[PDB]
Amino acid sequence: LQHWKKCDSWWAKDSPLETKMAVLALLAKILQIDSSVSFNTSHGSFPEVFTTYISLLADTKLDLHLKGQAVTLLPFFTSLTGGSLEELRRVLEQLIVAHFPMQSREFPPGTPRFNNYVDCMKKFLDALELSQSPMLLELMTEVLCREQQHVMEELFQSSFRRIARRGSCVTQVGLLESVYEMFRKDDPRLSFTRQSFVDRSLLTLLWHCSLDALREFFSTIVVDAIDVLKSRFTKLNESTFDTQITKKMGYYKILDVMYSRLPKDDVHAKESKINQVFHGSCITEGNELTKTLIKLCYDAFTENMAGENQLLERRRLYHCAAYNCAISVICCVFNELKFYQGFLFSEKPEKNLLIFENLIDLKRRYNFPVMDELNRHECMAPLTALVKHMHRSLPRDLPSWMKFLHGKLGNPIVPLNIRLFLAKLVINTEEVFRPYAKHWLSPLLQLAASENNGGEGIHYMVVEIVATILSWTGLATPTGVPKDEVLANRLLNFLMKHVFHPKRAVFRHNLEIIKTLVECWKDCLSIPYRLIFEKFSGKDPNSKDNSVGIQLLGIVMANDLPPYDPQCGIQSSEYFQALVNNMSFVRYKEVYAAAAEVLGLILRYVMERKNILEESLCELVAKQLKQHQNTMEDK
């Protein structure tokens, strides 16, 4: 490195291309054995090597690999540098605008331009990781934040975690300040991009910043968001204010993650480090300014929703954000079940759960994928955690405000979107919820009995309701309560009517719900036998579709044998004849033989119950098999 004037015999604009690559490797290696003890920290002809980049980063005649390696030298050239950052920034600016588009859908992957582009991004993350630097972290985020899920950001996120883990609190203050000041300042840009700044970079870093003095950031900034949240409501007078629902939104989203991580001994104690909501000079004994300022979340819950707005999606997820924050402060500081209840579950008629949810999305299921598909909605994981935690921290009054709200409002007074959202918090939480199932089932099974759930026939939500319902039976055992019967009748008639599926493995599963839905759980049946006849009896020599009524009669048989054809509006002299006659349809095994397999159980029933019909049904069977004996010896 001392021979730096002789070294300047290379790096010329007129150089052999393989040697334009080869020269970089020597300085790229040297700093890895040297660790920047010369030609780096304001020492040697550092200004000359650092200005040589102004000639190189201006060339046009290149692949992305001279440039790709050049950006990989930066981790050393701006380690510890207190100046010349504007010399770097202007060539980074001229590089990024030329080589990379505003959106990645410019390219199908495997076109060479894209493989070179993603390699520049790899080389910049390789550069970021061991720069540990706020200059590069800032400059990277504004290249990422332009659309969602477009460069496989799940690889980029790993670099943020890695620098958040391995570094000092003072460097991490520099990181966190630079990305905060970027988000805080209101120089005009698209609101969607403006969300993604916190949401898809800053927030990812916060979750992984080091355990101690992470409080130093929040204690330095906390006054800003609190002073922001208390105003602007008289200025919703034009559409550009979507840039503002974004700021309040992000400002809820940079503190719930700080109620997360942080110790109980800082957030509720005799000594209030975070006493900065007030001046804190006099309020050093005890922390309660949180429960002074929960009012801010309250406004974000209970705003009487506007009559004619045009930002409703951003309104919705704003209401969600402050609700997450209300979870996060309460589940830390407000330790009573009385204040976990709090306002948090207990509203005046500007009711919470009616506000958080879009009321027009058809929100349909898929029983056949490829939970985090449509459970991917806001709040759901937080609320499973909220109830799960307090189940370890011990009553019907908590769910009374929920189950009987969605239950007694069977009417359109709540939309179906609300009822399914409430029901989802049951389904994923049965093992947390067993004690109350007796009075919860009247609401919860009424949902699956209601004439619409969005399901075209059976769908995964009814499957989850009926599975949870059955799963309660051992401890809860609801039978014979006055509504249970008339709903169970509607369940069985529906579950059986729509049982079929084009895919054999799915059809076999629907059928297996019935087997336990009777034998483990109802006397209260009124078995839908008037259907069952139509599910088999429609003659055609190449029908497979008779077979379902065979299989289904095999379920209503195998459950310790309830009787067949009592008073159901159909005649035994026709009904059983068809059920035998099916075994003429010899084209398919499951059509003909399965009818005989059922009948060999029917005789065992009627003979052992000593009823007269075996005097006739034995003759029906015998008459038909004779037709095979003379004509089809194998069948």
Partner: peptide, 7 residues
């Protein structure tokens, strides 16, 4: 419900 807020 302002007294489920506060204290």
């Amino acid at each position: 419900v302002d007294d489920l807020l506060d204290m």
